Design a protein around this ligand. Structure first.
Ligand SMILES: Cc1nc(NC(=O)NC(=O)C(C)(C)C)ccc1Oc1ccnc(-c2cnn(C)c2)c1
Ligand SMILES: [Cl-]
Ligand SMILES: [Cl-]
Ligand SMILES: [Cl-]
Ligand SMILES: [Cl-]
Ligand code: NA
Length: 280
């Protein structure tokens, strides 16, 4: 999951976020997992706004699991709002199981959407909005660690936000998640230093961000097409193999991909720089 690294960093729950669970009628299950699901719902009056906005609710495994949902909610209250990010609206932590309420994204995940099918204006759009999201997480020294297309959601306007299905994601049955000890990690999206040296930074998320780019401009090809994950693979990234340019990337964008896939973390760009190169 997404952790807070050491701009400048300075975590108990704030009861301001609290919401009467009494004002929620659930809908269809939007996704489900090894310890959790996520569901359509409607919220009867959150904020003097006093709306009836449609929302997603996450929910739960023993107290080993409780811990991490609260920690999740903690993190999401430390960061505060941003438009290209899935925003915490509220929570119900009393009178029942923990419920975490977030914004809703009608069009769902970017990977399925890209497969279901849109212009190279729209890819530049998607690419720029997610860049705005990570740049925001980066600025709070928040790392994500599963930056992939499947975890980009499309909301009102087909506008992109980064979230994380996390608990509500069937990792166990997803072959994009290889085994490694207790954990199961998205190896094809990981910077080398994370695979080999278990080190994870903002600059690590940049590696993953370059993969997202390869997805976006392949319209949802699984990365390293046909290449299995085993002895040969790890060597190729240690050697410094790189995916070829995808079909619909203007060469400019492929250079962005290659920047991100620099081996020494300290020579990859930042989300701000990426954000700024997309301004032009
Ligand atoms: C995906 C997803 N992510 C998050 N993540 C989250 O809060 N993240 C963060 O805080 C970080 C710091 C990692 C950015 C939370 C919930 C969630 O669940 C949704 C949300 C909206 N919409 C659908 C949905 C699914 N299908 N449809 C049609 C809508 C599913
Ligand atoms: Cl109680
Ligand atoms: Cl935007
Ligand atoms: Cl796939
Ligand atoms: Cl070109
Ligand atoms: Na798996």
């Amino acid at each position: 999951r997404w952790k807070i690294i050491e701009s400048y960093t300075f975590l108990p729950y704030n009861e301001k976020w609290e919401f009467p669970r009494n004002n929620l009628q659930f809908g269809k299950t939007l996704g489900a997992g090894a310890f959790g699901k996520v569901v359509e719902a409607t919220a009867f009056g959150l904020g003097k706004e006093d709306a009836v906005l449609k929302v997603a609710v996450k929910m739960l495994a023993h107290a080993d699991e409780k811990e991490a949902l609260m920690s999740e909610l903690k993190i999401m209250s430390h960061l505060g709002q941003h438009e290209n990010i899935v925003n915490l609206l509220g929570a119900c932590t009393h009178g029942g199981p923990v419920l975490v309420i977030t914004e809703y994204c009608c069009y769902g995940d970017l990977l399925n959407f890209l497969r279901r099918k849109l212009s190279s204006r729209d890819l530049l759009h998607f690419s720029s909005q997610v860049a705005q999201g990570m740049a925001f997480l980066a600025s709070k020294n928040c790392i994500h660690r599963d930056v992939a297309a499947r975890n980009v959601l499309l909301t009102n306007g087909h506008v992109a936000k980064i979230g994380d299905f996390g608990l509500a994601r069937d990792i166990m049955n997803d072959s994009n998640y290889i085994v490694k000890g207790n954990a199961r990690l998205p190896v094809k999206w990981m910077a080398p230093e994370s695979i080999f040296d278990c080190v994870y930074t903002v600059q690590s998320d940049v590696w993953s961000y370059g993969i997202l780019l390869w997805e976006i401009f392949s319209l949802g090809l699984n990365p390293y097409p046909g290449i299995l994950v085993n002895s040969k693979f790890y060597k190729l990234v240690k050697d410094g193999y790189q995916m070829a340019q995808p079909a619909f990337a203007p060469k400019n964008i492929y250079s962005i991909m290659q920047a991100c896939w620099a081996l020494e973390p300290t020579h990859r760009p930042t989300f701000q720089q990426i954000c700024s190169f997309l301004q032009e």
